[PDB]
Design a protein around this ligand. Sequence first.
Ligand SMILES: N=C(NCCCN(CCNC(=O)NCc1ccccc1)C[C@H]1O[C@@H](n2cnc3c(N)ncnc32)[C@H](O)[C@@H]1O)NC1CCCC1
Ligand SMILES: N=C(NCCCN(CCNC(=O)NCc1ccccc1)C[C@H]1O[C@@H](n2cnc3c(N)ncnc32)[C@H](O)[C@@H]1O)NC1CCCC1
Ligand SMILES: [Ca+2]
Ligand SMILES: [Ca+2]
Ligand SMILES: [Ca+2]
Ligand SMILES: [Ca+2]
Lengths: 331, 331
Amino acid sequence: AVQYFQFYGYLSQQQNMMQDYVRTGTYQRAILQNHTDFKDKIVLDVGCGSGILSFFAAQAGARKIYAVEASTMAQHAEVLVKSNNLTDRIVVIPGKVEEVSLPEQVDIIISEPMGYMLFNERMLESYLHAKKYLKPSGNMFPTIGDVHLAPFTDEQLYMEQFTKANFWYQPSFHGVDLSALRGAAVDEYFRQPVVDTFDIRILMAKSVKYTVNFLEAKEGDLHRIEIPFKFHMLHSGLVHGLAFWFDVAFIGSIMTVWLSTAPTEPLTHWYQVRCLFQSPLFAKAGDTLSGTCLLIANKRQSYDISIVAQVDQTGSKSSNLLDLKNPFFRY
Amino acid sequence: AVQYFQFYGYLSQQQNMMQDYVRTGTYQRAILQNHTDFKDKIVLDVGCGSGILSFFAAQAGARKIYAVEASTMAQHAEVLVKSNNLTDRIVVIPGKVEEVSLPEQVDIIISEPMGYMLFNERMLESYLHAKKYLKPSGNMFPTIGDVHLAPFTDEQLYMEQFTKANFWYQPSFHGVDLSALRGAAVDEYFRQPVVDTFDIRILMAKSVKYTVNFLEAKEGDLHRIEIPFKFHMLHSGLVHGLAFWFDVAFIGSIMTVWLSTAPTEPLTHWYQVRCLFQSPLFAKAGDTLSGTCLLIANKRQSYDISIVAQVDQTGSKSSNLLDLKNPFFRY
Ligand SMILES: N=C(NCCCN(CCNC(=O)NCc1ccccc1)C[C@H]1O[C@@H](n2cnc3c(N)ncnc32)[C@H](O)[C@@H]1O)NC1CCCC1
Ligand SMILES: N=C(NCCCN(CCNC(=O)NCc1ccccc1)C[C@H]1O[C@@H](n2cnc3c(N)ncnc32)[C@H](O)[C@@H]1O)NC1CCCC1
Ligand SMILES: [Ca+2]
Ligand SMILES: [Ca+2]
Ligand SMILES: [Ca+2]
Ligand SMILES: [Ca+2]
């Protein structure tokens, strides 16, 4: 937890995030095409970092913006507020949104709480917690989140996991036989979600959607997330795992603006995420691939991912337990 | 601390370390050219990881080897001990060397406790702590450590720090003026030690040495390490900072074997480390560059690095406080 706020304390991290053109431009467009929703309103900016969303709120005419930031990035936001001549309008409050005091309720909460697969980092729990400060007529920006799942075929990725583990086949590494660890090494590679982009041609079925409505949802809804799926296979081949991406919608008065990290859309720094099965499933076009993705929040600010899939027509089944805290960055 | 043992729990980390050819080959050569020092002896392997050094001890004829490992890598070492038919000779003890019980004192302690700049990670403190289990005739492998410091000239590295920070000059980043943060960003880049290799031609003076004798030294000797230096400048130019590397010596009966991470030597995964000054010093050939490097152990398993240097002939002086827990990996 002291490791999490240190890492977000670095101007190099804020720079890397601000250089995501889709992320920065989409938030500006969401807030400013919906400027009447901000005009003379009160705004809470949760995990504000450098404060850019507070500035966007100010561009839209907000009367008062409370910018809450738990890391030492708070003192840098304060410097930009003074230097952009907005001390009367933007108030930086150093601390966790759970532990700080605001003097008044707000019309609108803005935030960027999305991790890889949306739920990673569980700053979503802090976004929902912040609703205690929201007037009952109030909005949230973003408003809803959709996670997309789809089965994929990628024998290169699958085989790459075996190739990495084949170091451990050496029967004489300096007179030591490593081979009894090859299986454990394979296992550990397969437990890593793969973060990179891929061509949509590798998807074998249309995605299924799981929606979180941030206006209605509560902190506890996210300890255990259950995503049942029935896929109508559009292609015949080995299914090597499930691909994940997410969309969030900023639902204003004037306009609904979407931020999409789909593989059909321009690349973002969220990329997309793939979880391999231990063992691939053969499916023909016309078969159904059914099962559950389960996300269980662990006391390490992340999620255990359980995936179970079965081809209904053959009963060929495959699973994996993956660890969203040890991603493999293949990009 | 739960983050440190998790990270060393991964077979991919053990593989990456074993693929350091100089590291693996030098340890095998040290232990096996000095096999009479192991023949029928008792051995403590501190932070054994996968157990390779215990296997080297066994190749040399050791009677009993206690392999202590605090991470879940312990259960993988146990698998290799069973599969290499050595359960009578190698005993894996899961836990910290500080908290576990050995039934007998040992003739020799072996370990790989060197971090970047030698002291990084402070597993050296665990190596010295282990001496409570060492017979008074006992040896330590490795036996001594030398840290080397030398001044360097590298205007490309120096200027690269400004180039990175120039993102923050933008007077209209989406209608926000970032420029008041440019200085803080420069500052933060200069506080990162640079981990990569370089051509010896960039060194401006012969290195100075600071020796740790692991046989004599005690845990507390490493809370505060003071490295005074007087450099006789061999070249005329800007001195942009200090370069660091280290050598350890395995001093056996038969042979002293050196593991060197010097820039004249074959590359290792320790690379070398450079700390920039805020401001470079002009020195002519014949001048003396004098000052102190100070390492202060912080409660984050790392060191605050203080560097002060002055050209005696001009009194031009320069400093930096660097953070060995936020290295920049430039390689
Ligand atoms: N996006 C992520 N991760 C999401 C979380 C980051 N988050 C948002 C960064 N705020 C940001 O850039 N804002 C400006 C911006 C936003 C959008 C567009 C342009 C500019 C983390 C931030 O919340 C803070 N925090 C965590 N828990 C708490 C708490 N309890 N209370 C208060 N603050 C808390 C943290 O210290 C930190 O400042 N990763 C990368 C993938 C690609 C894009 C970037
Ligand atoms: N070398 C490092 N870092 C140094 C520390 C690593 N260290 C040695 C890895 N042991 C290793 O590879 N051995 C085999 C080997 C050795 C040499 C040659 C071939 C094979 C960390 C290990 O000690 C453990 N630990 C930490 N604190 C404690 C404790 N209190 N008690 C007990 N164990 C503790 C940890 O969990 C872990 O298993 N980094 C890279 C730079 C280039 C080379 C690799
Ligand atoms: Ca503005
Ligand atoms: Ca060999
Ligand atoms: Ca052996
Ligand atoms: Ca712009």
